[PDB]
Amino acid sequence: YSYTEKKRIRKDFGKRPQVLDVPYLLSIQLDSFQKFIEQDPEGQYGLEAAFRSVFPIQSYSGNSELQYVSYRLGEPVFDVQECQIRGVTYSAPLRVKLRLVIYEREAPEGTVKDIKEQEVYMGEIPLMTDNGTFVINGTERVIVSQLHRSPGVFFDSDKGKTHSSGKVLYNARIIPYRGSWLDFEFDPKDNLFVRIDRRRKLPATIILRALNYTTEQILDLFFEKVIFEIRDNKLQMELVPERLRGETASFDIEANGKVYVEKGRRITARHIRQLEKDDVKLIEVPVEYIAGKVVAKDYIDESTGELICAANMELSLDLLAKLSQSGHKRIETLFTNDLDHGPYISETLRVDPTNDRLSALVEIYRMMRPGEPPTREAAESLFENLFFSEDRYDLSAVGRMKFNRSLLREEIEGSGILSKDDIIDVMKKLIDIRNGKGEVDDIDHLGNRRIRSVGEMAENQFRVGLVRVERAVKERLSLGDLDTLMPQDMINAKPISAAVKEFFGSSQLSQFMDQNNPLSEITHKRRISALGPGGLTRERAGFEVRDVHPTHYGRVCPIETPEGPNIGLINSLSVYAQTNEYGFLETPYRKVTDGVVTDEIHYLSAIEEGNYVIAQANSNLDEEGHFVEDLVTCRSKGESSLFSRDQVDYMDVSTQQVVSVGASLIPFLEHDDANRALMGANMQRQAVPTLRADKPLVGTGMERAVAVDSGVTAVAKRGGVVQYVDASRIVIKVNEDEMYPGEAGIDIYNLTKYTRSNQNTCINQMPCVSLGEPVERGDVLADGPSTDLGELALGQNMRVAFMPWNGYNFEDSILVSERVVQEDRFTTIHIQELACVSRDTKLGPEEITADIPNVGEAALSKLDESGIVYIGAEVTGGDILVGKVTPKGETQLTPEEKLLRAIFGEKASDVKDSSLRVPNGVSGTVIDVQVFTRDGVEKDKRALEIEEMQLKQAKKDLSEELQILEAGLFSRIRAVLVAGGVEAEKLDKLPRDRWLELGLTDEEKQNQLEQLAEQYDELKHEFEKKLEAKRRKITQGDDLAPGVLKIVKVYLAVKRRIQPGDKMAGRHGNKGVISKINPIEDMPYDENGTPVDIVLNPLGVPSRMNIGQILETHLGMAAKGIGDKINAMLKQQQEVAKLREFIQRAYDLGADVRQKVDLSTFSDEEVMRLAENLRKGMPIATPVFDGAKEAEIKELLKLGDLPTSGQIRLYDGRTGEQFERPVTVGYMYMLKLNHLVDDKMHARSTGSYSLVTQQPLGGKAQFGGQRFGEMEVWALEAYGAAYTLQEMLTVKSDDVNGRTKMYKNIVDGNHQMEPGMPESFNVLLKEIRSLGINIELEDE
Amino acid sequence: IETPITANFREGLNVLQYFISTHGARKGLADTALKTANSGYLTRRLVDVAQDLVVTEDDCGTHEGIMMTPVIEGGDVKEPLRDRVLGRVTAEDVLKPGTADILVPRNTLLHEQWCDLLEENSVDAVKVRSVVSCDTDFGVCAHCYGRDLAR
Amino acid sequence: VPLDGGRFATSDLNDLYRRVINRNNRLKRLLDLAAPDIIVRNEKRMLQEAVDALLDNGRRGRAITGSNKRPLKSLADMIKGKQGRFRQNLLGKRVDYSGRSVITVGPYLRLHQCGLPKKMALELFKPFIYGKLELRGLATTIKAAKKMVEREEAVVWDILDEVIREHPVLLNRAPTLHRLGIQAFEPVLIEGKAIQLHPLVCAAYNADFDGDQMAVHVPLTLEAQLEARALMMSTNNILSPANGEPIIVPSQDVVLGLYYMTRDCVNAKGEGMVLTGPKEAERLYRSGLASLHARVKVRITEYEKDANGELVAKTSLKDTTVGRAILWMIVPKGLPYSIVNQALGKKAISKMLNTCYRILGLKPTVIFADQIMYTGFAYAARSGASVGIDDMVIPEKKHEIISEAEAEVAEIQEQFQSGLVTAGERYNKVIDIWAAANDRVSKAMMDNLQTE
Amino acid sequence: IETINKLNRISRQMLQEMGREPTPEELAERMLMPEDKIRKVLKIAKEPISMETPIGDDEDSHLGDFIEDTTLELPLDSA
Ligand SMILES: [Zn+2]
């Protein structure tokens, strides 16, 4: 057990012995990036394969050459946070050592000609945190693993799109990891056609002629040959017996001197059985039988050397005779049983007009290069590029192995390019299944799809940069000098860096991650999609892909995906999801052995399990022996069944082995519909952690692990003892067993204060521990924004009863009590951003100074002299932050303003203001400022104020770091000086430093003196090094644009708490707007005076089957039935043993739940702190499907001295009555979301306009105007209204004279109109007349 | 599917039951998604046909049109001749199976008093002046339409 | 044109223009030369290609791009389809004097009224106010007026109330399918930031109070004012012109309140007795002397007319439960007690309504509806209504039907193991027996929930 | 134009022999010519960006909406 465990324990109700604790959660992102960057000697992954692929590199034609050797990472310039703050990417440089070598092709291979060893920077590399994310431009971002169609080879069968036929359309396809595609297919009219890369239809044999094949060899391999034997008078044949299998005879189909099947008669399976056993294969027959068959191959009378017959030529009887005169006693022939064998290929040859390799390749060349003349070399060059060149075609061996499997091949490896045998065998399989043998495959089956993780993407962009470089290097190598041209001379790295930085920040995969809540992070990185490149599109995509397949089970949870278009597209991961080396998924499963369930495991892919059988964990096992009952709900083969006991081979692992985590947290999910559970789990992400961390009592257990692995919060890495604490940070010391001796081995953990989220929300950590305490590794020390003692919490729990109330909960609205807002317990805060900037101009710069005319002096009062507000101040809309000013030009004027400034005579300078200000409606508090300035420009007064500030601040942080470090490191100077001589009573009083020079002795203390000498030299070494290092790390200016001079930032903050119009909900789809607060006097109250917190509407519970939640409400109440009771014992202040008994009796309530406990173990004090925690409640952890039962809750309410109903007798408060009947009441857990009335409200009366068309914009940030589509207008003309929309088009959008006139007029109380004509109309007129058009208008 | 459910919510589900409910509900949502698309699509066409039409006249003065007949096929009534015509106009001088009992000057409104009065008799098919009959040049006569329902 | 950062941006058309011009003049260079007409043809080709690329890029063939690996714009792409000027800049509009918000409920409203957060309206009636300040001599000018307005004195709010008198509004949910996706309302205002909405019309919008936002425009001028008062005003729009049913179905709790209230059990008290009229019936129920669900012989009164608009006093006695007696109290003078001695599920309410309309019309109907919603919510709250586990009822014999069905499938399993039935016959058998079990268990569970 | 060309011809080699981007003073020294030219060059070196670029995540709306007619009038100031 643990300490934070002892600080508070949550209760169990699950009776299934787990065998596998959850793993680390997000291993995959880490693993992918690792294997991308890090080293591979031989089994190439990542960079090294990209290089070895694209290296070595010759000259233009050979004489010089380049040789990859090895790479070199660079540690970065800065740390994380410095990059965070400057708006800068975190990244590592890259060098590579290259070797240029020339060899005298003038000589035979005269190598020893020159060498240049040199290593070269090219590009830097963004990097991964320990969490798993990246950062760019002071922006934290994450990309997403993808899911798409594997390489290899696929089949399919379209459903008669010449549905005149209603016929099958078999077709087959290969897909490489790179290169060109290929499509084979049957036409409806019984002929093969083929096409690369969705080109036009071509035949299938066309390629074979193109590949130097013969019709001879073609029919050698494809067909099973029908052969004859004529000896000078008439025909014999040879009947492989099952060739008339089920067929009808033609003549007296008859044995040697015997008939088996007469004319026009079925050849039974038994007649061919006779033919098989009765051992005849030499069958004299009528020759007229031949009429219909086809020649094998051209067997002529070569005496002439003239064609009596060409292959692929249906036979005759005259020609039978002609080759009889040749003397040839047999000519082999083709087979055709339309049932079993398909001569479609022979038919295709008969359609083929082509003969040779050459014109075949001409036509190929032509198709892929239309309009181009025939040229041999280019033809064979093209072909050889497309399918056997390593340059432009790659399977990426998963395709290779998978292909091999799909052909049932004994081997797994090969190349990333083709053989010929491949093509043969695939067309053979296609025709075999066209006959009907085998099966087509299903695309949705996960054994045919693959993820695509980060390392793969990054490989791609990196190598394509390498190729953008080698183009030039080919352009340059054999051209010029070959002794002075250094390797570096030719490389630009900017293609590489360009590619990679464009990917990490402008692909549609990288996103600004979700700083709402921990789970938001962990799920948003545990997302999967099939969008983007190598992917799909919702309009291109349909329904089969959206939906579910029975192989998802154990890999992907069907419940957690939004409600818009992109429904089944994304499918977030499962829990025990591992992936595979090739990119495949797998899931653990338990081994069975002779009915025994063994503890060992295997991780199994999407495929093998169907061949196997698998049981479930609902199965109540018979205590270490076998499983209890005979029938067991197992499954194989895609679906389920019931099986016996010896019959089974494997079993599932847990009762959660499918779900996602949001599909994990909620208990009694079993008692709910699916759709609403989905909705709520998607409601479980838009939340805020409010001002506090009010824990949910009832959960499952997963809260702590998600909390930890989010990495938001602190944790131990070595056990030990606290040494110092502050709200800002802590200090620890390590135990000496965990201590490594030479290192200082004394840790520290600074913390994160109020800090803008990507979603403009606070962030903060905090400690939840004490001093003088022990700690072990991994023990938490501080909490995140949504945690409490290392266990998640987002919202809060509280009192609800179920009833209508006067209409204020009409349709799933809400009604609440005013204690909760004065408590501020869902109150939250929002960091917000603003900034201004100083630049150059053509006239001159913008500059930064208070001194600005035409100002209310009190506005200036809030500033320093530089023109800048202080810290910790109050701000209101329209207030000023910065006095920035701009060199003016000139101002032309009117006679009346001229008149006024002739009267008073005031002027303007040749400067004006650029004062940053508060946006409208905002008000808040300033708590930080940040300023950046170029390296070279003078840091002005306040720039220096904060520069010397942060100087002091970090220097104090570091002199503290020092001071603690050196202080602990004086450990020598007492044990060493008080021995090696001893004068302690005389020594201790004296100054510490004048102790080198006391009574000095034999060489032991000489070594002591030199030791301390070197060490207090290392003293000032450390000082100089570290201080000055960071000193000019800091004091240096900034890396930024032209024009700019310096900038200003402001990190202010604002306080938000609850008012109407807000959304909130709970863990079961129970949405709701809030409609009104109320006082407590109007709320109810039990007989014992306790009022109620919130009230809702109970009608809609069967309306939407969110039934399970009600259960918890009972349970909810029950917790405090202990909690409050214990608080009595607190103030009653009884005694140890009473509550000790009481609480172990509580934990031993249920029947057979697994968690045990012995509190006799504990102290008194452990117990009393435990109770001081539990004083407010007792939290529970029932898992989802090893859930609890109402038997226990009713037992527990008997324990807490309460109704078995959890349903009790209530009063009104506005008039004091009793109600007519009981009501269900308890505490439930709910929370807020990020859809807030002032984040959602806007109005407008006049303002921002376009210029293309001059009607207003949209967007609240830019003073949004409202939209008015084309169906509203349909409605209005429905009512018969013209004047209204006349106004809505003339004046409130486009016409200018009208809008101005009428403004001026209503200010004179005139509600009148004066229309004209719009502008977008005349726009359209011009834009037509551009097109050569005499459009115009007729006078009346 | 072969084997059904064996429980309810209150009994507490098991894995497969919910697992199998999933794809059903997901299909329901997928179908929910995009009825909207085709709906608005064809709807825009529906309108764009009918940009023009408008009333211009009260009485076309034209010939009778259709005969109305109820929908009692397959089972019993599903739209009575009584109910459908409510608010239409009358084609023609008609009367009751009690013969020679006329009710119109070729044209009368059909408020429910008359549907009652005529549900007395066993009248079971009756003609109407519809728009197809109406011969208004770029317009439609009122009487060939019926009643304004909202009014 | 530039933007703030100092960078120009270019109507890509410009590129499409400029190249063209230069080649034209290149031709005029070569024109001085009578050079090989081959290359001249090359230049002609280049022109024609450029021109038709400009007028419609992806029409002749290859759609040309800029540097971005991205296509371009002809002129036509300004006119066509979605981003065409028609349905993006000529019918898909933006509007001044507008706003929006989230919505919620006013369960006390007088439906022709609407909820409104103030500050929205404070922007939306602004230059009005400016003119009126100038009119009253308070702020004789516009920056004076504006400073007072930013200063938002109580006079300002007073004059806001002055203007909103009579001065209407107009709504919009999205997506407007039919025309009752807007109605005209009358302003009433709320200290908040959310709009309160009269519950009934939610179905006219298909609006559900689970994150709803809708929008506002103004019937600014006078003709709009009149129309929105006369036409889109929700009072004058109650019947679907698709089909003359009304859309004022009271939905889910008001109905529940009535049904609970008007109900004829026996259980309670105060039984087999007499009254003089409903008023002391109300009296005693307030006193806790007898429940409403208890049948009683009392007096009533009702009115009719077969007349030339001339009423008929009539009076009598009836058996009745009590709530019936009370809610007689509203009904205006044209309808009998026959309508109120039932349990009142939805359609009953629909029919009392449409009768009132057909017999009287509009104003009494809306009033009746208002009082219905009021009293339904009120007595529904008094009613008390909750949900629990045990409110849901298993039959006991849910184990046994299932066991005998298991016997059935065991039988047909072993028969198919003998291999007589096709699996399709078996399939049909199985589905039929399971539907049998389902519907009979439905029978049983209703037999333990309906009147027991 | 050739100024920009030679500038970048030097910049490539500053990139190598630094492993890092240049500084205006350093290549000013290496080129022996003064700062503000480099300043206004890099101010002027960049090209325009296409009114109808897709600033949205998807084709949500291009950059045109995000532009102001900061030219003509204020009806307030007009009155
Ligand atoms: Zn007509």
Coordinates of C-alpha atoms in Angstrom, one line a residue, chain A residues 799 801-806 1078 1080-1092 1095 1207-1223 1225, chain C residues 381-382 384:
Chain A
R799 CA -28.2 18.0 -3.4
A801 CA -34.6 16.4 -5.7
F802 CA -36.8 15.5 -8.6
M803 CA -40.0 17.5 -9.4
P804 CA -41.4 20.2 -11.5
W805 CA -41.4 23.7 -10.2
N806 CA -43.8 26.3 -11.5
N1078 CA -33.6 31.2 -6.1
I1080 CA -33.3 29.3 0.1
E1081 CA -36.6 30.4 1.7
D1082 CA -38.4 29.4 -1.6
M1083 CA -36.6 26.2 -1.9
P1084 CA -37.8 23.1 -0.1
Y1085 CA -36.6 21.7 3.2
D1086 CA -36.8 18.4 4.8
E1087 CA -38.4 17.9 8.2
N1088 CA -35.0 18.5 9.6
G1089 CA -34.6 21.9 7.9
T1090 CA -32.0 21.0 5.3
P1091 CA -32.8 22.8 2.1
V1092 CA -32.0 21.6 -1.3
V1095 CA -33.9 21.0 -8.8
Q1207 CA -37.3 8.4 -0.9
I1208 CA -38.6 10.8 1.7
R1209 CA -41.0 13.4 2.9
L1210 CA -40.7 17.0 1.9
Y1211 CA -42.1 20.5 2.4
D1212 CA -42.5 23.7 0.5
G1213 CA -40.9 26.9 1.7
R1214 CA -42.8 29.6 -0.1
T1215 CA -45.9 28.4 1.7
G1216 CA -44.7 25.8 4.2
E1217 CA -46.9 23.0 3.2
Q1218 CA -46.1 19.3 2.9
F1219 CA -46.2 17.8 -0.5
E1220 CA -48.5 15.0 -1.4
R1221 CA -46.0 12.1 -1.5
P1222 CA -42.4 11.2 -1.2
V1223 CA -39.5 12.2 -3.5
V1225 CA -33.3 12.7 -3.1
Chain C
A381 CA -46.0 21.1 -8.3
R382 CA -48.4 20.5 -5.5
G384 CA -45.6 15.9 -6.1

